[PDB]
Amino acid sequence: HTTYKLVINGKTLKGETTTEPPDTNRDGRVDYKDAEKVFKQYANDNGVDGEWTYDDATKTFTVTE
């Protein structure tokens, strides 16, 4: 799997978390697009809703107020 990280910096909501989406394609790696959807599910569970960005250089997700 491929490790992705989510960094949230909202007004009242914030925190960091990682995830590794199941490689059901057996590709040997995971696209950020899959991790994005998973992280958005994490946001839905936590009630987080801000501006989503993604760092290509470090493969990192960020949500800001």
- Is the distance from CB of 55 to CB of 6 less than 8 angstroms? no
The owner of tokens 């250089």 is 57
- Give the C-alpha distances (Å, rounded to integers) separating 57 from 12, 17, 49, 54, 60: 28, 18, 24, 9, 8
Output the six-digit token pair for 21. 């989406």
The tally of domains found in the chain comes to 1
Owning domain of residue 35: 4-64
Which ranges in the chain belong to alpha helices (H)?
32-46
CATH number at residue 34: 3.10.20.10
